[PDB]
Design a protein around this nucleic acid. Sequence first.
RNA 1: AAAUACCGGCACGAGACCGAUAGUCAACAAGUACCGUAAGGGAAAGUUGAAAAGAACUUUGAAGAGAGAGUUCAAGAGGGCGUGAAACCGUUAAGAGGUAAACGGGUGGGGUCCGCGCAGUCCGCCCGGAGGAUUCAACCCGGCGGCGCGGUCCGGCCGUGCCG
RNA 2: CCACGCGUCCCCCGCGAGCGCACGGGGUCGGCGGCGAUGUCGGCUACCCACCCGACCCGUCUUGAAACACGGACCAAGGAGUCUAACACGUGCGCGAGUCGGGGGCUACGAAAGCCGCCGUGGCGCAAUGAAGGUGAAGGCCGGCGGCGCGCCGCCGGCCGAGGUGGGAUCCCGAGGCCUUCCAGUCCGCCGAGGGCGCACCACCGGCCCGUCUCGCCCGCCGCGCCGGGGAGGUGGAGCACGAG
RNA 3: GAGAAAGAGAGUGGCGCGGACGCUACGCCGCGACGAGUAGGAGGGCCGCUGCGGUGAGCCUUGAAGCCUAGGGCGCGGGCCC
RNA 4: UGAAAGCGGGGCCUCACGAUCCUUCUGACCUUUUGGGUUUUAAGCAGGAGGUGUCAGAAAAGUUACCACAGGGAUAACUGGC
Lengths: 52, 187, 124, 52, 105, 147
Amino acid sequence: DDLYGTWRKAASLKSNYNLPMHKMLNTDLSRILKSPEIQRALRAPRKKIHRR
Amino acid sequence: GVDIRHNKDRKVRRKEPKSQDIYLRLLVKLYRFLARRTNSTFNQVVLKRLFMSRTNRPPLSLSRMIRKMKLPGRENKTAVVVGTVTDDVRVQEVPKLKVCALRVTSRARSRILKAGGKILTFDQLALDSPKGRGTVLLSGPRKGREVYRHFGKAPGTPHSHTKPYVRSKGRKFERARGRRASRGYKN
Amino acid sequence: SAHLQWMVVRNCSSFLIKRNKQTYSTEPNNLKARNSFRYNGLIHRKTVGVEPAADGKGVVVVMKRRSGQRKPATSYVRTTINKNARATLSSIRHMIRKNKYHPDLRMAAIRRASAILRSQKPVM
Amino acid sequence: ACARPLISVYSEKGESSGKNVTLPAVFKAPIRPDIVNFVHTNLRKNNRQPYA
Amino acid sequence: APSRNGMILKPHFHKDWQRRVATWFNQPARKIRRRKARQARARRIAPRPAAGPIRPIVRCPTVRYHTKVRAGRGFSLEELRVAGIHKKVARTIGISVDPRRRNKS
Amino acid sequence: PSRLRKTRKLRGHVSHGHGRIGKHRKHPGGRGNAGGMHHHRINFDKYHPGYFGKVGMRHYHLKRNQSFCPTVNLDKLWTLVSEQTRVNAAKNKTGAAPIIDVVRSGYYKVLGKGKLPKQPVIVKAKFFSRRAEEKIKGVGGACVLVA
RNA sequence: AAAUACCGGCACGAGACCGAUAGUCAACAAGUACCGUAAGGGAAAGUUGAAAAGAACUUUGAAGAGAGAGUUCAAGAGGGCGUGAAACCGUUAAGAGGUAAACGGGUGGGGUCCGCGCAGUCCGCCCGGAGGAUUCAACCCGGCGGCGCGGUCCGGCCGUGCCG
RNA sequence: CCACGCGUCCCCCGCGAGCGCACGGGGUCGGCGGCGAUGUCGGCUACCCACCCGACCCGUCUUGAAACACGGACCAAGGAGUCUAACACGUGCGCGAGUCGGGGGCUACGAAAGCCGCCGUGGCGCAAUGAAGGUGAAGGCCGGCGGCGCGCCGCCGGCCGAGGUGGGAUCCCGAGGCCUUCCAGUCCGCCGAGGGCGCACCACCGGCCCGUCUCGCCCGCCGCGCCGGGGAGGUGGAGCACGAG
RNA sequence: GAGAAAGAGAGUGGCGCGGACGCUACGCCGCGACGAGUAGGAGGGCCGCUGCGGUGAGCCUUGAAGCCUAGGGCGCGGGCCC
RNA sequence: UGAAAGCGGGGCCUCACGAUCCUUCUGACCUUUUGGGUUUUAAGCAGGAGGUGUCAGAAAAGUUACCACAGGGAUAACUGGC
Ligand SMILES: [Mg+2]
Ligand SMILES: [Mg+2]
Ligand SMILES: [Mg+2]
Ligand SMILES: [Mg+2]
Ligand SMILES: [Mg+2]
Ligand SMILES: [Mg+2]
Ligand SMILES: [Mg+2]
Ligand SMILES: [Mg+2]
Ligand SMILES: [Mg+2]
Ligand SMILES: [Mg+2]
Ligand SMILES: [Mg+2]
Ligand SMILES: [Mg+2]
Ligand SMILES: [Mg+2]
Ligand SMILES: [Mg+2]
Ligand SMILES: [Mg+2]
Ligand SMILES: [Mg+2]
Ligand SMILES: [Mg+2]
Ligand SMILES: [Mg+2]
Ligand SMILES: [Mg+2]
Ligand SMILES: [Mg+2]
Ligand SMILES: [Mg+2]
Ligand SMILES: [Mg+2]
Ligand SMILES: [Mg+2]
Ligand SMILES: [Mg+2]
Ligand SMILES: [Mg+2]
Ligand SMILES: [Mg+2]
Ligand SMILES: [Mg+2]
Ligand SMILES: [Mg+2]
Ligand SMILES: [Mg+2]
Ligand SMILES: [Mg+2]
Ligand SMILES: [Mg+2]
Ligand SMILES: [Mg+2]
Ligand SMILES: [Mg+2]
Ligand SMILES: [Mg+2]
Ligand SMILES: [Mg+2]
């Protein structure tokens, strides 16, 4: 953490460097998807296969 | 046979992002689900903008964000850019903003957080509002790129304000026959 | 997390093997032995595995525990099951179901345990 | 993630010594194998002698 | 035979340039040559400064650069005779001298 | 990589992507951009107007150092000096105004592009434009010269 | 003097290079053989085997060349000799034949082999019939594991949080 | 006859149970029969041959090739869009009004890798226009002093303060109601008549900087001058008009 | 899956421990319409050659590379495995 | 010019004509003339002119039977064809 810095501390023995910021944070996708915030606001699944 | 002409038979638009990034493909794996399984078209247009190329999702700057968020009516709403929210140095005070972007530059993150704002990513945006309600979707200036000054009606044609490709701007470099009214003709 | 690890180990792993228009993974905790998100066994917080015992009688069933994720020595727990064929499947079924321990693959575990048991009974 | 664990330093005998340093933030910088492949591809070319 | 739209350009390759192309493959060998020579020189003048003599405060000539001060060539004779250092003793104890500098200020 | 290019998918095609009526001959339109006046006339007039002829005075020994005068704007005039001077000259009730010495930051001429915040300055430049001077006066604050 | 340049020369190290029609013209008795009056032009050409153990001897023929015998793991490696393809050719076996041969679609006949075919699959559950076990459930003891459902059990650690 | 009962005010004359057949969201048999160990069974394909129908030899230039057009005896190996520079556009990646150490320096693979930041000198960008001298990118409202046949205002103090019209994905408010015995009535969402704030972009009108032309009155002083600044109205520009490199 | 903008919404008063497959999300699945092609353009190759960084507790004198083949096969095909 | 409405920036309409470079002339109390000033000269800026008639604009005589080369059956001299 002296080399590449912390997320809030800059790099102590480089000149101007900080860690690259994430593009999404909560990476565990299933704990987003089976969460009551989303699972509330969804339509009902239509999984009845209607063959020819 | 059939006399249908197959020229425009195939749509050209994207179905997956060209990037081999894995965080962007996780955001796509989330918003595919949200646009397939909700009925709000914010999700469709936000996955359509996650798919795009980085010359089609241009960097929205914080001056545009402050203006288009201080337009009346949309107080305490969530600004959403799919591109890169960049700092704009020619603005002094910054109001409390609630923004969401793929990637915000470091000085803009510092500026918003000293103003007392809050930065979100798209996974946190989907947790905070799944149908995307309470959001103002903004995009950067797409024809702001310098390339579009070379496009359109070609130079050397009447009423065409197009920057011509020249190797160095100066006195001698294509100022003479098409441009003057003495030297030849003025278009 | 888990999907982050899956988007890395998904194509460029060393357990993956690709030939004859099929695909697999020779990783040590893969029920059904195939390259998938659900059945892969290194990228999850909780994971069953079914191995034949070191001696030629029974099945060691492997559980991945919840506490020591980054500590691979105290991360897995072996349980040796040397019983009749019905109650081996009954133990694996109760073990996965009533713990609510990753119930996606209770059926795959009892399929693999049945295959190991028929390989372990003698050959005509 | 955001939280940082506490990794113990092992002695040369093998078992755990009492010292434990927090995880540096470098280990939870983002993982991007595409640009690891990109940087490795373009930097494995630099040690190459010419042939003609 | 130029196509639709694009910068018309004059590449300077009309000479025979392939018999004369300086290729830089001895760049790191030349850098290690120079720094081994620099280490040998710096340890053969053993307490003296490795950078050589001292070089004076000098303002750059032209309008683009006169606000920047850089290290010059050598101390002029007029500031040497004001500082009381002799002309031929200055460079023998380590003070660089060029007589060509004026002092208009 | 030659593995990804076109010629790995033009093997077996008997002309290699350059036609069979008009073969890929060596130099059909002359070398380079030849034929400006003559047979590429309408390329050079539909796409490079102005190209032929002389215009303007000849300057024999040009020196960019003599012509050197780079510009800054009143938008970014406050960018030069740190935020602590802005917030101190905002908190400062004594009417004291900061000095903005643009020359050591590296810009010789102040032009006035945009809005300057109502906060007094002493802008210290080498040149000024009329609108930049009027905007600094209208904020209330002075424009001094240094050579 | 220094920093600078080096396809010649002495001596070196290295290669995302070439692998005997490639790489130098040249891996070899190569600027050699050879052509031209001359200036100059200028090749082709590596591989027995581990070790020569390079086939003693008998035998027909004048001999080249054979047959036996022998060395070797191997002569199916025998002094231009590893591997030994294609065009081309001899012979054997099979099949065939008056529209030059060939070819595409469709079958039929004959081969060649393959199926280790030639009384034909197994697998759960139930019922019956004869068997064999230290044998099932429930309990008890020990270990291990999973989880407000402890509304709020005690203790630590962390924050890409906040207040002092 | 796809007509079913009871109760009442007026007009004209909301859960019954069971079984079963099926012209019913794509084939099943809860039907069978033969032959099989040294001569038979299967194997489309691949070896040879027979027959029917089809069947001109390839490449290439061509308006047209089987051509009485040229190349081609047969076989093996070699054999042709490469590399450097420049530019343009699209695309992925990092940083983002900045960016880049490529040249230099400091510390087996490694001639790699890392580091510099008072090594950003510099390139490109952030500002254009003019041939050049040069110039160099919103305005308004309030108060005081025809100035007269500058309601305009020359300048001072305060205030608002950085375009508009149309189309616009997104979002925002919501007249009503989305049923389980009936009336009110809450909270959570959901849908929507209408109405809003409107991103990118497009079209148009305005505006601002440089050149240039025309018409005009004002202002500044250290030099009152062949000085300097200012306005209105058209026009030329590869411009600005809250970056995009 | 059903001709009809929208809740198998929550509140307040009047024994036997059992339930197939799935989901390389670049994956799997359902509907329809469609398929000519020289010049040329584009996409995909689990088509192929040679070498380098990883990797297969890969293979190999109990016989690799190559070559031959009336043997068994797979793929529309490039080709490949026996 | 007509009294005036108006008409007229060449010929009742449809042809009567010419880029860059260069030279000449015209224009302004114009710009540069390179360290400063003055003065000739030269360079500019705009507007005409000198002209390319192959008229979107090279500066250009023959011969080959001593002939050559790249090609063309796009094109002659035979036959054959309508
Ligand atoms: Mg059809
Ligand atoms: Mg077609
Ligand atoms: Mg198309
Ligand atoms: Mg072309
Ligand atoms: Mg083709
Ligand atoms: Mg051709
Ligand atoms: Mg062509
Ligand atoms: Mg042609
Ligand atoms: Mg060419
Ligand atoms: Mg011509
Ligand atoms: Mg080395
Ligand atoms: Mg050879
Ligand atoms: Mg050779
Ligand atoms: Mg060879
Ligand atoms: Mg040989
Ligand atoms: Mg050989
Ligand atoms: Mg052998
Ligand atoms: Mg051999
Ligand atoms: Mg041989
Ligand atoms: Mg025969
Ligand atoms: Mg026929
Ligand atoms: Mg031809
Ligand atoms: Mg031709
Ligand atoms: Mg012809
Ligand atoms: Mg043709
Ligand atoms: Mg003919
Ligand atoms: Mg020919
Ligand atoms: Mg021939
Ligand atoms: Mg070949
Ligand atoms: Mg691009
Ligand atoms: Mg086709
Ligand atoms: Mg008039
Ligand atoms: Mg002079
Ligand atoms: Mg004669
Ligand atoms: Mg005739």
